[PDB]
Design a binder for this molecule. Structure first.
Ligand code: HEM
Ligand code: HEM
Ligand code: HEM
Ligand SMILES: [Fe+2]
Ligand SMILES: [Fe+2]
Ligand SMILES: [Fe+2]
Ligand SMILES: [Fe+2]
Ligand SMILES: [Fe+2]
Ligand SMILES: [Fe+2]
Lengths: 159, 158, 157, 157, 158, 157
């Protein structure tokens, strides 16, 4: 058994994407926790862990077909200062990922490979859920007010 | 053995500093708790207890080298009415302490005394963390708004 | 407080090194587990997690001094096919890291910054222990024999 | 509801295949346990039980569509004496099964029947995992050596 | 994102169908329990709850794609007096639902939307099982005998 | 990894010192317990065990740098029949050890070796504490009176 080259190319693209996402999410988690904002930090931390699990599963699969995982590349990473910028960066990344996932699932299942198609289907469902949450939070921030919004996620620790 | 005089002088200065810090912190804790503000009172009480432990360790050390602790002198104490003033006073005190600690560690480890240098290093790390927290809270107050800020640390028990 | 630029440069270099090490270790862990050598996969996973913790500590420190962590670049990554090659790659990486750590600790503690020096001291101790273990295992493989050695790591479960 | 004839034909073929696989795996389990290689007998017994569950599920499905299960015929069964021969026989069987599964899934989902397609997809995933394990063990035997390999599965208890 | 209109139309139709099914099942459960027949009441109650949850999941999905759920329209509801009539009504409803589900899954997965296709696949499996059980019970009633059949689902609780 | 010769020389000196200290402490513990004095025996026993741990740590370290531990030498051992003489011997030994430790830490950390410097720092702290306790007890004996002092560390057992 030896998966065709194009399947491996798509798997490698998705792996690199998930890696860059992991890096971005962890950096944002730290940089938010540093400022006092706590619950946002916890949420982003859990999100990063989930993306880590994604990367692991994709690596295992791409390795089962007699392939060569690519742990050397990385796409551009973005950073922000306020909240709106962080949320917008995350939304952009998720949109790109979803588009790639759909195109790949189509072109792949058109060649009799099924398990990889199922993997992509699961990843797609999860990424869609995540982008939905992001959009909801962004709309909320837009409505309430940046200061009045932040005013509800700042708590003093237990010294 | 018996440590040289300059080491003892530095230890005594640091001891007096920690004592004044304890006094200021407890006064601020009480004066904040009285107004309704609660979580700030808890935090400040904890910090005061930490500085107490600091002073205890420093006095033990300064006494091991055949010295004469100085429990008779205090520096100037500051008080405020709003939150900004309290935080600024605390920040100033911590900055002064940090500078003294660094200079002392240098001049001390340049004379073959190690344990005191380690004590100073620990104290320095702790004061670093504390000044960091103070600056963070001050920036937060600056951004949100004094009233809107206080509006989240008030409470009633009964 | 604002740490001087050179301290930040050294911290960033060490951070990038730890990141590349994490990546290499996890890749090797997976690629070894895939073949049946489980008892090696376990150790390698543990080491990768340790390097993760190292990276987090360095990030926090470099961020406390009003700096700009660099999560964008990586050094070269190496891969092998047998065991000897993996061990040799890891040994090379650790040697480089140790040299950098020593030079940095010196040039740093020469400027009245103590906490970062202590961080580097801890990291150095750990990396030294690890390189020692690697050298021991390599000598053992050299003596016994690749076949014999492998013959005691397979599990069949 | 009445599934078309071709779906039933494919289901019956897969059922017969799983039955022959069950028989082969249990025979090999016994014949290996008899010689002392216990740690292989355990694995083979578990594998046989898994194939048994496969057969049960396929029978239930083929019976829900108003069909006639075929518990009367069997394909050829192979036996060996060493380990390499056993592993090679199992590998051949799994390859054949995988090819049939893929062709069937395609021709089936092209006719608006979904549940059977899902059943085949699950069976395919499992058979693929199994063939992977077989290939790994075969390569390990190739490398170490029959004597060495066998020397780590005898129990004496 | 924004799901195309046809996907939303199919989702709304399926939602309305599941709602009418919920209503019919609960009415039948009550009307059977009232007469003494107990185990049939329990079974129908459980099935009604299942169809409820079905409707809930479909509503959530149709709402995630920026749609407008339709909780205002219902199809026709049927009632009976004996058991045969109830079972036949349920069988008819399930057949219709199955056909709709298949056509929808096809036309939907032909447009790059996957999650909705998976939802429909699950619903289809469940409706398959249910129609199977209905047909089995109907054949059993046909064979044994209506009176002799009922004679085994009565208890002294009323 | 190969520590320079001078570091190894200092480590060996300290190892031999700790060994002689262990021997002296255990001999004194036994010789005190024999006479009826109990709590003194317990204290000295605990101190001997602590010095044992010291020796073990130093041996491990000196062996990590590709060295040759020296378990053949021993410095002159002292013994006294009274109590004051015991305390004075212990005080002398500790003073010598402290001086050596300080000089070694300096000359060592002046050559880019950190872990050994940390080991010496810990040992130095401990020896400081011990000499302090010894001096305190000696002053107490000087004040109260040998008879009075002995009168509070005797039991029936
Ligand atoms: C100090 C706490 C932690 C830090 C700083 C941390 C950070 C990281 C980072 C940066 C990665 C990058 C992986 C990559 O780039 O490929 C990673 C990987 C991973 N971490 Fe952690 N993590 C922490 C806690 C944990 C713990 C405690 C576990 C498990 C017990 C865990 C599970 C994982 C897993 C499963 C991966 C897989 C990465 C991959 O497959 O590529 N994390 N971690
Ligand atoms: C105005 C109120 C207080 C003042 C001025 C005060 C002052 C001090 C001082 C000066 C020391 C140590 C001085 C030295 O070591 O030379 C100390 C030790 C200590 N006191 Fe307080 N104290 C106060 C309240 C309290 C209370 C109410 C408690 C217990 C309920 C308490 C518990 C302690 C503890 C635990 C320590 C030792 C801390 C450590 O070991 O780290 N203090 N106090
Ligand atoms: C005329 C009678 C009833 C109607 C029309 C009705 C309606 C509904 C509907 C439409 C849902 C949404 C369920 C879903 O999303 O799958 C629901 C939820 C639920 N119903 Fe009812 N209900 C009725 C009676 C009851 C009663 C009396 C109970 C329990 C005593 C019950 C048990 C539940 C439960 C447990 C849920 C939770 C749904 C979930 O967690 O997914 N039903 N109800
Ligand atoms: Fe992901
Ligand atoms: Fe302090
Ligand atoms: Fe590291
Ligand atoms: Fe099977
Ligand atoms: Fe339904
Ligand atoms: Fe010692």
């Amino acid at each position: 058994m030896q998966g065709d080259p194009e399947v491996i190319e798509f798997l490698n693209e998705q792996l690199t994407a998930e890696l860059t996402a992991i890096n971005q999410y962890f950096l944002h988690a730290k940089l938010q926790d540093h400022k006092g904002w706590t619950k946002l930090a916890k949420y982003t931390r859990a999100e990063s862990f989930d993306e880590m699990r994604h990367a692991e599963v994709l690596t295992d699969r791409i390795l089962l077909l007699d392939g060569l995982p690519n742990y050397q590349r990385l796409f551009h990473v973005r950073v922000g200062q306020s909240v709106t910028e962080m949320f917008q960066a995350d939304r952009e990344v998720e949109l790109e990922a979803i588009d790639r996932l759909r195109r790949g699932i189509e072109v792949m299942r058109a060649k009799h490979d099924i398990t990889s198609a199922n993997v992509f289907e699961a990843i797609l469902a999860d990424e869609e859920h995540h982008i939905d949450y992001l959009e909801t939070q962004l709309d909320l921030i837009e409505k309430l007010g940046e200061s009045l919004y932040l005013s509800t996620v700042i708590e003093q620790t237990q010294p």
